[PDB]
Design a protein around this ligand. Structure first.
Ligand code: HEM
Length: 154
C-alpha cells in the first residue's frame, strides 16, 4: 500500500503534538494496551508483576520504555513509507527474541488510536484517524512480511 502526501501530512501533524510530551503519551499508550488486552503484559518480564493501573503509572521503568517505543515509531513514521532499514532490526527482535505476534501489534495500534483521539480531538477527526490507521496498517503489513522472511510468520 501507498499513502498519499496528504495522508502523511495528517499523520505528521498530530504526531507533532504527541512529540510535545513523548513520555506522557508513551505511558498512556502502554497502560491502555495492558488494560484492554491483559495478555500482552505477559510478554514483558520487566513489567509482569505490576498489579494495578496505579502501579503502572508510578513505574519509572514503564515510562522509560514508553519513550523508547514512541521514539522508534516516530522515526519510522517520519520516513513516510521509506522505512525498510528501520524496520529490519525491529522485526528481528520482535520475532526472535520477544516473540510478538501480529495480533498484538494490532492491539497496540488500537491503543495508539484511542489515546490520540482522547488527547487531540481537534487534530484527530475522521480523516486524520483514517490516515493514521492506514500508516499503522502499512507498518504492520511490512513487519508481517519481514516476520515471514525471518521464519516466524506469527
Ligand atoms: C508500535 C509497536 C512497537 C514498537 C515501535 C516497539 C519498539 C520496541 C523497541 C525499540 C524496543 C527495544 C529494542 C528491541 O528490543 O527491539 C522494544 C522492546 C520490546 N518490545 Fe516492542 N515495540 C512495539 C510493540 C510491541 C508489542 C505489542 C509487544 C508485546 C506485546 C512488544 C514487546 C517488547 C518486549 C518484550 C521488549 C523488551 C522489553 C525489555 O526491555 O524487557 N513490543 N520494542
Amino acid at each position: 500500500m501507498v499513502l498519499s502526501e496528504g495522508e502523511w501530512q495528517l499523520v505528521l501533524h498530530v504526531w507533532a503534538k504527541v512529540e510535545a510530551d513523548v513520555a506522557g503519551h508513551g505511558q498512556d499508550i502502554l497502560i491502555r494496551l495492558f488494560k484492554s488486552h491483559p495478555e500482552t503484559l505477559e510478554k514483558f518480564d520487566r513489567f509482569k508483576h505490576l498489579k494495578t493501573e496505579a502501579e503502572m503509572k508510578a513505574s519509572e521503568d514503564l515510562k522509560k520504555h514508553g519513550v523508547t517505543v514512541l521514539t522508534a515509531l516516530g522515526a519510522i513514521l517520519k520516513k513516510k513509507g521509506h522505512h525498510e532499514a528501520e524496520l529490519k532490526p525491529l522485526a528481528q527482535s520482535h520475532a526472535t527474541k520477544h516473540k510478538v505476534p501480529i495480533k498484538y501489534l494490532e492491539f497496540i495500534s488500537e491503543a495508539i488510536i484511542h489515546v490520540l483521539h482522547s488527547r487531540h480531538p481537534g487534530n484527530f477527526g475522521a480523516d486524520a484517524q483514517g490516515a493514521m490507521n492506514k500508516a499503522l496498517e502499512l507498518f504492520r503489513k511490512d513487519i508481517a512480511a519481514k516476520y515471514k522472511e525471518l521464519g516466524y510468520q506469527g
